[PDB]
Design a protein around this ligand. Structure first.
Ligand code: HEM
Ligand code: HEM
Ligand code: H44
Ligand code: H44
Ligand code: H4B
Ligand code: H4B
Ligand code: ZN
Lengths: 405, 405
C-alpha cells in the first residue's frame, strides 16, 4: 500500500492513510524506541522567513491564487519587511485565515467541526492594559450573547524584538478562586491556587466562597500586570440542578458559561501572538466529570454518592460511575434549562467523526490526540474510541508558553 | 534524554530509565505519533545469538547468580547449539522465567501486579493436535478451578526453520459463535464470524443461538487443523442478572468465566512459541462495556435502555451511559453470586498504580500503553487516567502473528 500511516477504524472496519502528516516540520516527543503520546507537556532571519513563506503559501492556496502574481508580490514584501526590520506584519485576512487554521490544526480539540466559524477580533492596535480589558469585555459580551454562545478570538499585538509581551496572566477569562486553608485543604478550585495568590499579591481583596470569580491580571509591554474586576453581569453562570433528584440543587453547585482560554500562544507564519484569548462552548464532561469530579478539583463524587445513598465503602458498587453519570446529566439539564449552549460527549464525538471525514477529503488527514479526544467518561460508548488517530504538529498552531512570572 | 513521567493528580514525577533497554522499535517517529494504532505497521545466527545471550543474562541475573560457572557454561551451551544448528532450546526453569517476564513486559496489560503468580505448563513434548487438546483441557481445568480462577500458560513447541507452526486457530479457548445472515447481519458474537465459518467448513455442525461455544481448530505442523469440541463441563459460564432490575435476567445474557488468549506469539531469547495459550481472569469492563456494548459486538445498549425506560431519542439524556453502568453492575453482581473470580476497573487500576510503583523501584520504569490501561468507561474516575506512561517494547514479549489461514 501507500507509504503513509495507515489509520483504521475498528467499529466500521474502514482504513484511510494520513498524507497530511508529511506537511509537519515540527517534531513531536515520540521516537522508534519509545512512545510519549500520553504526556501532557513533554519538553533568526532566515528561520522566520522560511516559516513566513510557508504560511504565505498556505494562504494563497486557501484562496486558490498559488503561483499568482499577487502571491509572489506578497512573498517579496514579506522578505523586504524582514530584510529591514527583522520582523513582518500580517494582512487582516491573513490573520483571520491563520487563526482558523490554528484551531483546525489543534490535535487535542474535539470541537473542530466548527473551525470555519470563528469571529476574529483584530486587537493589534491595543497599547495599554486598560484597553486590553475593554477588548476582553467586548469579547465576552459578543461570545456570551445571552447564552447563545459564539466562537471568538481576540488577537493582541504580536511579540516584538526587545519590547516586552502582551500577556493575560490568568489561564482562562473566567476562573473560580482557590483559597489554601489553615489545614492545607482548599476552598474553591484547587486548579487556581497560584493565580489566586498572585491576584492577592497584586492587591486583590480575596473573598471566601467556593465559586468566587477571579479578577484578571493583564500585562502590557514592559509594565507590571494590572488588576481588573469583571463586572458581575458580564459573567453568565448556570446554577446546577438535576432533572429528577430534587436535592441536587441544594448542593449549591454552579459553573460559568463561557470557556475562554487565555494563556496560549498563537503562532502564525513564525509570528508570535502571546496574548490571544479564544472562546467557544463547553462539552459537558469538562464540567461534570473533570472540573467537578477530579480528585484534585472540586472532588464532589463522594458527596453526590452519599446523597444518592450508594455504597461508597466498596468499589464494586460502581458508586463512582453512577454519581458521575448523574452529575453529567445535571450539567446538561441545567445548561439546557438556562438556554446556554453546551454539547454532550456523544454529540461532540459524532460531529468530530464527521470532521475527520471532511478533513480526509480536504487535506488527507487530521492531526489528533486520541487520549484527549476520547471523553473521560463512557469512552468506548463514543465512536472516537474505535478510531485510530495520528498526532503531529502543524502550523499555524496554538502552543503552551511559559507563565509570565 | 530519558522520559520524565508525571502524575497530574498527585503532582509526583519519576524518570523512566528502563526504556533504554528496548532493542525493538514501535510505530512512532519524531514527525508523527501512532500510539493509538492497534496493530503494528510492519505486520541470522548473530542476531539470534545476541537475543539469546541477553535472555540468558536476564535469567542468571534473576536468580542472583550472574558470573557463576553455571552462567558461563550455559552461555557456551547456547552458543555451541546456535553455531551448529541455527537454533537452541530452553531449559524448563528458563521457560518459566521467560513467560513471567513476557507478561511483566506487556504494555497493554492492567493485571501485571499478578505477574509473579503464573502456573507454567511445559507442553513442548507435544507431537499432534490430539495431544495439544489434552494439554488444553488440562489447562482449562487447572485454570478454572471451579471459579477460583488461577493464572496459567501452556507452551507448545517452538517455531522451527524447517517447518510449519503449531497453532491454535481460535483467538481464545472460549468463543461464542457468530452466524452471518443472508441479510449480512450477525447472530452471536460478530467478532467470531470468520472462525465460526472456518469451523463449519472443517466439519462442525453449527448451532443457532447467541451463545454457542465454538469447537477448537488445532493445527500440528504442516497439517490441516483438526476440530475438537470442548466438554461442556470444562466451560464454566455465568448467567447474567441484575441485583435490583428483575427483568435483566430475562435478557438471557451470559458470559464465560475464563479468558484464555490463544493466538499470540510468545518470544523468549529470540525463540518463538506460536502456540502458548495463556489465561487469568476478567476485568468486568471487558464483558460489561466492550463485549456486550460495543456496536460491532453484541450491541445491547438500546435493548437495556428500552427496558429501563430511558429516553433513547436524544444523546443528551445520557441513556447510553446509564445502561452501560447497569450492565457492568450486572456482570460484577453475577460473577460474585457465581463465586467466580473477577475484578472491577477501580480495583484493577488501583492495583496497577501499585504495580507502576513496585516496578519503578525494581527496574526503573514500566512500559504501559495508556489507551489500553485506562478503562472504557469512567476513565478519569480511575487513577490511571491521570498518570503519564511510556510505551515501549521489552523482550521477552507476547506479540501478534498472522492468522494461519
Ligand atoms: C466550538 C466549541 C468547542 C468545543 C466544544 C471545544 C471542545 C474542546 C475540548 C473538550 C477540549 C479539551 C479540553 C480539556 O480537556 O481541557 C478542547 C481543546 C482545545 N480546543 Fe476546543 N472546542 C471548541 C472550540 C475551540 C475554539 C474556538 C478554539 C480556538 C480558536 C479551540 C481550540 C482548542 C485548543 C487549542 C485546545 C487544546 C488545549 C490544550 O492543549 O491544553 N477549540 N476543545
Ligand atoms: C490475572 C488477571 C489479569 C487481568 C485482570 C488482566 C487484564 C488485562 C486486560 C483487561 C487486558 C486488555 C484486554 C482487552 O481489552 O482486550 C489485558 C491485556 C493483556 N494481558 Fe492481561 N490480565 C491478567 C493476566 C494476564 C496474564 C496471565 C497474561 C499472560 C500471561 C496477560 C497478558 C496480557 C496481554 C499480552 C495483554 C495484551 C493483549 C493485546 O495486546 O492484544 N495478562 N490484560
Ligand atoms: N497545570 C499545568 N499545565 C496545564 C496545561 C494544560 C492544561 C489543559 C488546558 N485546558 C483548558 C481548556 C483548553 C481548551 C479548551 C477547553 N474547553 C473548551 N470547551 C474551550 C475553551 C476555549 C474554546 S473551546 C479548556 C491544564 C494544565 C502546569 C504545568 C507546570 C506547572 S502548572
Ligand atoms: N484481529 C486482529 N487484531 C486484533 C488485535 C487485538 C485484539 C484484542 C485482543 N484482546 C483479547 C484479550 C487479550 C488479553 C487479555 C484479555 N482479557 C483478559 N483478562 C485475559 C486474557 C488472558 C489472561 S487475562 C483479552 C483483537 C484483534 C488481526 C490480526 C491480523 C490482521 S487483523
Ligand atoms: C496523563 C494524561 O495525558 C492526562 O491525564 C490527560 C488524558 N486526557 C485528557 N484529555 C483531555 N481532553 N483533557 C485532559 O486534561 C486530559 N488529561
Ligand atoms: C483505536 C484504539 O486504540 C482502540 O479502539 C483501542 C483503544 N483502547 C483499548 N483498550 C483496551 N484495553 N482494549 C482495546 O481493545 C482497546 N482498543
Ligand atoms: Zn507515540
Amino acid at each position: 500500500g501507500p507509504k503513509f500511516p495507515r489509520v483504521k477504524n475498528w467499529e466500521l472496519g474502514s482504513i484511510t492513510y494520513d498524507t497530511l502528516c508529511a506537511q509537519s516540520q515540527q517534531d513531536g516527543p515520540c521516537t522508534p524506541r519509545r512512545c510519549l503520546g500520553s504526556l501532557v507537556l513533554p519538553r533568526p532571519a532566515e528561520q522566520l522567513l522560511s516559516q513566513a513563506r510557508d504560511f504565505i503559501n498556505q494562504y494563497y492556496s486557501s484562496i486558490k491564487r498559488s503561483g499568482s502574481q499577487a502571491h509572489e508580490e506578497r512573498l517579496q514584501e514579506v522578505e523586504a519587511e524582514v530584510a529591514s526590520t527583522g520582523t513582518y506584519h500580517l494582512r487582516e485576512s491573513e490573520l483571520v485565515f491563520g487563526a482558523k487554521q490554528a484551531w483546525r490544526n489543534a490535535p487535542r480539540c474535539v470541537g473542530r467541526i466548527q473551525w470555519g466559524k470563528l469571529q476574529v477580533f483584530d486587537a493589534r492596535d491595543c497599547s495599554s492594559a486598560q484597553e486590553m480589558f475593554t477588548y476582553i469585555c467586548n469579547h465576552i459580551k459578543y461570545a456570551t450573547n445571552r447564552g447563545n454562545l459564539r466562537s471568538a478570538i481576540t488577537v493582541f499585538p504580536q511579540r516584538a524584538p526587545g519590547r516586552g509581551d502582551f500577556r493575560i496572566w490568568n489561564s482562562q477569562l473566567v476562573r473560580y478562586a482557590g483559597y489554601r486553608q489553615q489545614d492545607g485543604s482548599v476552598r474553591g478550585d484547587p486548579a487556581n491556587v497560584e493565580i489566586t495568590e498572585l491576584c492577592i499579591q497584586h492587591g486583590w481583596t480575596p473573598g471566601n466562597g467556593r465559586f468566587d470569580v477571579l479578577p484578571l491580571l493583564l500585562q502590557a509591554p514592559d509594565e507590571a500586570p494590572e488588576l481588573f474586576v469583571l463586572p458581575p453581569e458580564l459573567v453568565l453562570e448556570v446554577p446546577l440542578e438535576h432533572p429528577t433528584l430534587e436535592w441536587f440543587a441544594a448542593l449549591g453547585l454552579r459553573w460559568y458559561a463561557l470557556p475562554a482560554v487565555s494563556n496560549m500562544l498563537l503562532e502564525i507564519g513564525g509570528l508570535e501572538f502571546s496574548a490571544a484569548p479564544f472562546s467557544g462552548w463547553y462539552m459537558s464532561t469538562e464540567i461534570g466529570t473533570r472540573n467537578l469530579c477530579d480528585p484534585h478539583r472540586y472532588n464532589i463524587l463522594e458527596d453526590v454518592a452519599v446523597c444518592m445513598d450508594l455504597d461508597t465503602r466498596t468499589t464494586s458498587s460502581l458508586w463512582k460511575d453512577k454519581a458521575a453519570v448523574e452529575i453529567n446529566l445535571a450539567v446538561l439539564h441545567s445548561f439546557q434549562l438556562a438556554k446556554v449552549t453546551i454539547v454532550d460527549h456523544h454529540a461532540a464525538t459524532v460531529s468530530f467523526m464527521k470532521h475527520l471525514d471532511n478533513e480526509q477529503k480536504a487535506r488527507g488527514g487530521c492531526p489528533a490526540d486520541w487520549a484527549w479526544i476520547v471523553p473521560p467518561i463512557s469512552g468506548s460508548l463514543t465512536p472516537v474510541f474505535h478510531q485510530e488517530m495520528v498526532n503531529y504538529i502543524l502550523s499555524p498552531a496554538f502552543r503552551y508558553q511559559p507563565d509570565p512570572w
